[PDB]
Amino acid sequence: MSFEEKVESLHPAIFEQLSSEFEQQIEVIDCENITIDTSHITAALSIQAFVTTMIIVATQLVIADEDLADAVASEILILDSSQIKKRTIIKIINSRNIKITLSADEIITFVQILLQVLNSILSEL
Amino acid sequence: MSFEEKVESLHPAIFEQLSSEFEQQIEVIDCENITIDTSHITAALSIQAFVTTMIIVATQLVIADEDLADAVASEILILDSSQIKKRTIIKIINSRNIKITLSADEIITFVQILLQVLNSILSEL
Amino acid sequence: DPMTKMLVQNIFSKHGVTKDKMKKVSDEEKEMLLNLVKDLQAKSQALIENQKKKKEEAAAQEQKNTKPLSRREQLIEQIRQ
Amino acid sequence: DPMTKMLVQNIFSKHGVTKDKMKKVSDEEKEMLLNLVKDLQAKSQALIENQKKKKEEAAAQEQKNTKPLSRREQLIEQIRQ
């Protein structure tokens, strides 16, 4: 069905773009045990990406004149581009054990901001 | 022939000792793609081990009074034991891809130091 | 909530979509959106509670770990044996 | 080179092998050592160039990878289709 296929096709395209902005490099010197914890990074990005396409696909469906639809959709994309950070908690447990942890707290809080936009848009319509 | 067999017999004994000092443990949590790159670690250790036995076998052959030969040979072994490190470059390409890399740079630079000792010993004799 | 009201009204008040441009459609497409939004609440909140319980648990085993006045007497018992 | 001269002379100046203890042998065993040392140079340098080309190549694909001012416009073209 048209609405289901369009949201499910825009989701992977948006998701891969979000993931590409989450690549960094950590270099560890003279260590034995290294633990890399990136849990919930993919889950939070999946939720944010799949809820972002809902915003730009809701206005696209209702509003004709596709030029306006592209304009509002583009403005949403730039909004998530800025004011998003990433933490790298490097916890040194022992003299031989370190633990690099990627924090999804900023993505989690930004999901709330986008969720309020989704609720406000739906109430507007 | 005596010189060829003695160097080719001391080489594996020295090489296995060097390898035994290059064992570590890396623990990865919640990751899909893991790449372990240990290239040139065995090649650099082979060169350093096979050039170390040349130093202790050159002085052993020329110099009589085996007690002195053991003394100089032991001093060479302790030299390589200290001031040798190891790097573990953990490059996080994506949120699901990490790449543990073992660097042979320290072994490479130490090969130059041992090579200069080999040249100086040969010029002395 | 009133906090997030004007950051979506101001963009609409710009050259974008205006009030008179709203189609105000009310059909079978509206209800299928409403249940999806409620599905978003269930999934997002599950992530929130999972992160929240991880945060307080990370502050739990350190509180349970009793810190004595001095951290050097724990190795005096075994050496004597 | 003069840099590495004294770290081998100082150990020999110790209770180890002295100048008068040198046999100073010059026979068929000397030439077979000389060609082996030159073989060491060829093999070691091959490792050095292999590592050197790996190092600059690792710094090559990142320079070729153009970094734009913003890294979020690459996913706007495909979504519109």
Numbering used by the authors:
A (entry chain V), B (entry chain V): 1 to 125
C (entry chain W), D (entry chain W): 18 to 98
Copied sentences from the primary study:
The endospores of Bacillus subtilis are encased in a multilayered protective structure comprising core, cortex, inner and outer coats, and an outermost crust. Among the proteins required for crust formation, CotV and CotW are unique to B. subtilis and are hypothesized to be instrumental in maintaining spore surface integrity. However, their structural organization and functional mechanisms remain unclear. This study determined the cryo-EM structure of the CotVW complex and revealed its filamentous helical architecture. Structural analysis showed that CotVW possesses a negatively charged surface that enables pH-dependent binding interactions.
The 3D model generated after applying a helical symmetry operation produced a high-resolution cryo-EM map at 3.32 Å resolution. The filament had a diameter of approximately 10 nm with a helical pitch of 13.4 nm measured along the grooves. The final atomic model includes residues 1 to 125 of CotV and 18 to 98 of CotW. The final model revealed 1:1 stoichiometry of CotV and CotW. Further analysis showed that the central β-core was composed exclusively of CotV, whereas the peripheral α-helical domains consisted of both CotV and CotW. Along the helical axis, CotV monomers stack with a helical rise of 9.52 Å and a twist of 153.09°, forming a continuous spiral of subunits. Accordingly, the CotV filament assembled into a two-threaded (grooved) helical structure, resembling a double helix. CotW formed the α-helical domains of two adjacent CotV molecules. α1 (residues 21–32) and α2 (residues 44–82) of CotW encircled the α-helical domain of CotV, contributing to its structural integrity. Notably, α3 (residues 90–97) extended toward an adjacent CotV subunit through a linking loop, thereby facilitating intersubunit connectivity within the filament. The filament surfaces were predominantly hydrophilic, and electrostatic analysis indicated enrichment of acidic residues along the grooves of the double helix.
